[PDB]
């Protein structure tokens, strides 16, 4: 169970390029016709993906590169060899839509994660060539603008890797131990919706009074130490001034990362600070003691009804998988 | 050498059936450990790829201290070895919030950094720890029965060695 059948599969994995080119040159030989088997196709398709996912860790941490002061540099050798993968993925996505129903295509929920990836990969080429053609020269990095093309053309490339690495969860249905765990996790995500609705109402209700009470004492940045304004500084300040900051403030205090001296106002007024502190203290009891003690009690009940018939719904899925090769 | 006094609990009637019930709980953390490991190496990459342009040195910092564990934390998302220790310690609450603020005045990067840091907490502290409880609760109520047939077997196997 653990040695020979574990080694044969690793052995076949390495042979995928030569098998591909052999099928390409002659499809009726004895080396050809050996890839038209439902298991070998699976192994080859699975092995052709870890190579792509491993040629991306080299671009994250530079193995060898040049200094970073030019506006638009030419692409390096690692980036020259990634285009074929993207082009092949787009061509395959377009081809799958042809010999299949359009309504039949849109009924799968994974296609919704293969559209966003493709869009975020397609924007970067244009955003990079624009800066390669327009700009020229070199200047230090501490004087660039906030909306420079070279700065916007890296955030999308950083975001895309996360959505491209979380797709190894659709392979758990081919195993007997990790199989029935995805089916039990699929049910838990139908319990957070209603509590999310109630929490959203309870949060926009409170996000209004606190903003209405504190919008008289808004200072500026130059009059503050170290020219820092808002939370995320070393000394937090101006936390209930606008409506966009009052919504980020209330979110971060669920985990415990908000201090208590942010309710103290200048100008000596004492009657306002007490009402502010009471409004801040009433919001914690409703959210941390009454609501999180109900998710547990409901998810406990929901789990004990899906434990049964958990093998009739995994075999259906893995049968639907096999029938595609 | 001091944690080996737990193999003597099988010779007593009160502490005996407790080790047998603890032995079953350790077969539930494995799969959640697998899923958590995948969810953590997925996120440990983007944050490292976004912040590796602003790595300073030690001599230009106060008191010649670089990294977390100083009095004023700094350089938390520079390399891949620090990004993996940073994400671990934040589960308990020992990481501050001013570590996502970069120099050089750029404002559009800090927002994306803060959003990436904030999305990782909801998936780990609200959706996963609320499932270990609900599954360990079910696993315990099936081993409570026949808990005296498996303790006497063990203590019989003990006696037969002397
Ligand atoms: O300190 C409190 C507080 C409190 N409810 C309390 N306490 C403690 C307390 C007790 C007595 C006194 Cl003479 C002063 C403070 O205690 C109780 C006492 C009886 C209760 F039944 C109860 C809470 O729960 C009711 C719902 C919780 C509302 C929190 C408001 N609430 C509150 O917003 N603050 C913040 C005020 C900022 O200064
Ligand atoms: O502050 C948040 C935040 C948030 N989801 C939120 N909020 C609070 C919020 C509400 C409204 C506005 Cl206009 C701005 C912030 O609230 C919601 C609102 C509806 C939801 F359905 C929900 C969360 O849960 C979705 C999954 C959680 C993703 C966290 C992202 N997420 C997040 O990464 N940050 C960090 C940003 C750093 O500045
Ligand atoms: Ca697809």
UniProtKB/Swiss-Prot annotation, chain A:
Glycans are attached at residue 136. The chain crosses the membrane at residues 39-59, 80-94, 109-129, 152-172, 188-210, 279-299. Residues 60-79, 130-151, 211-278 are extracellular. Disruption phenotype: Conditional deletion in oxytocin (OXT) neurons in the paraventricular nucleus of the hypothalamus increases anxiety, impairs sociability, and causes severe hyperphagic obesity, postpartum depressive behavior and reduced maternal care. Coiled coil: none annotated. Ca(2+) binds at residues 93, 96, 111, 114. It is found in: Cell membrane. Disulfide bonds join 228-233. Residues 36-38, 95-108, 173-187 are cytoplasmic. Expressed almost exclusively in brain, in mitral cells of the olfactory bulb, in lateral cerebellar nuclei and in pyramidal neurons of the hippocampus. Very low levels detected in liver kidney, testis, and uterus. Residues 1-35 dip into the membrane without crossing it. Forms a receptor-activated non-selective calcium permeant cation channel. Mediates calcium-dependent phosphatidylserine externalization and apoptosis in neurons via its association with PLSCR1. Acts on distinct neuronal populations in the hypothalamus to regulate innate behaviors including feeding, anxiety (flight/fight/fear), socialization and maternal care. Homotetramer. Heterotetramer with TRPC1 and/or TRPC4. Each subunit in the homomeric ion channel (via ANK repeats) interacts with one copy of GTP-bound GNAI3; the interaction is direct and activates the ion channel. Interacts with TRPC4AP. Interacts with SLC9A3R1/NHERF. Interacts with MX1 and RNF24. Interacts (via C-terminus) with CABP1. Interacts with SESTD1 (via the spectrin 1 repeat). Interacts with PLSCR1. Interacts with PKD2L2. Belongs to the transient receptor (TC 1.A.4) family. STrpC subfamily. TRPC5 sub-subfamily. This is Short transient receptor potential channel 5. It comes from Mus musculus. The gene is Trpc5. The chain holds residues 326 to 650 of 975 of the full protein.
Swiss-Prot record, chain B:
Expressed almost exclusively in brain, in mitral cells of the olfactory bulb, in lateral cerebellar nuclei and in pyramidal neurons of the hippocampus. Very low levels detected in liver kidney, testis, and uterus. Residues 10-24 are cytoplasmic. Disruption phenotype: Conditional deletion in oxytocin (OXT) neurons in the paraventricular nucleus of the hypothalamus increases anxiety, impairs sociability, and causes severe hyperphagic obesity, postpartum depressive behavior and reduced maternal care. The chain crosses the membrane at residues 25-47, 116-136. Residues 48-115 are extracellular. Disulfide bonds join 65-70. It is found in: Cell membrane. Homotetramer. Heterotetramer with TRPC1 and/or TRPC4. Each subunit in the homomeric ion channel (via ANK repeats) interacts with one copy of GTP-bound GNAI3; the interaction is direct and activates the ion channel. Interacts with TRPC4AP. Interacts with SLC9A3R1/NHERF. Interacts with MX1 and RNF24. Interacts (via C-terminus) with CABP1. Interacts with SESTD1 (via the spectrin 1 repeat). Interacts with PLSCR1. Interacts with PKD2L2. Forms a receptor-activated non-selective calcium permeant cation channel. Mediates calcium-dependent phosphatidylserine externalization and apoptosis in neurons via its association with PLSCR1. Acts on distinct neuronal populations in the hypothalamus to regulate innate behaviors including feeding, anxiety (flight/fight/fear), socialization and maternal care. Belongs to the transient receptor (TC 1.A.4) family. STrpC subfamily. TRPC5 sub-subfamily. This is Short transient receptor potential channel 5. The chain holds residues 489 to 650 of 975 of the full protein.
